DNA sequence: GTATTCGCTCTGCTCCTTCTCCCATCCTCTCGATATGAGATCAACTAG
């Protein structure tokens, strides 16, 4: 991306469906979001269990 | 003789420092590391 690109593509809007398939940038941004979910799931457990 | 201070003490108030505590449950597997006898004392015999 160009510098200072606040457009939807650049900042992680996946304009495709799962049937259409994600583009490589959409794939990476989606992996980032899913990683957030995985970290939350793996980090909340200790602190909720305590 | 009372102002007036004034030195000194008594808390007491924030704050910074220390220190001590805690950090889900359960389960499977692999892998590495991790002396000896002589003399003395005593007590049980073991008989005289």
* Radius of gyration (Å): 15 Å
What is the helix content? 40-55%
Structural category: mainly alpha
> What is the approximate shape?
elongated
Helix count, per DSSP? Answer: 1
- How many strand units? 0
The major beta sheet can be summarized as: none
Helix-strand string:
H
Beta-strand portion reads: under 5%
N-to-C CA distance: 44 Å
Briefly summarize what is shown.
DNA-dependent RNA polymerase catalyzes the transcription of DNA into RNA using the four ribonucleoside triphosphates as substrates. The chain is 52% helix and 0% strand. The chain has one helix spanning 24-49.
Describe this structure in words.
This protein is mainly α. Helix content is 52%, strand content 0%. It is built from one helix and no strands. It is elongated and about 45 Å long. It binds one DNA strand of 48 nucleotides through helix 1. The PDB classes it as transcription. The entry lists the keywords DNA repair, ubiquitin, transcription, cryo-EM. The entry is titled "Structure of the Pol II-TCR-ELOF1 complex". The protein: DNA-directed RNA polymerase subunit. The organism is Sus scrofa domesticus.
Short key terms for the protein model shown above:
50 residues; DNA-binding; transcription; mainly alpha; part of a larger assembly; 1 chains; cryo-EM; ubiquitin; DNA repair
Topology of helices and strands:
Blueprint (H helix, E strand, L loop, with lengths): L23 H26 L1
The protein binds one DNA strand of 48 nucleotides through helix 1.
Organism: Sus scrofa
Protein name: DNA-directed RNA polymerase subunit
Subcellular location: Chromosome; Cytoplasm; Nucleus
């Amino acid at each position: 991306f160009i510098k200072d690109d606040y457009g939807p593509e650049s900042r992680g809007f996946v304009e495709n469906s799962y049937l259409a398939g994600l583009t490589p940038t959409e794939f990476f941004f989606h992996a980032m979001g899913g990683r957030e979910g995985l970290i939350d799931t793996a980090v909340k457990t200790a602190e909720t269990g305590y």
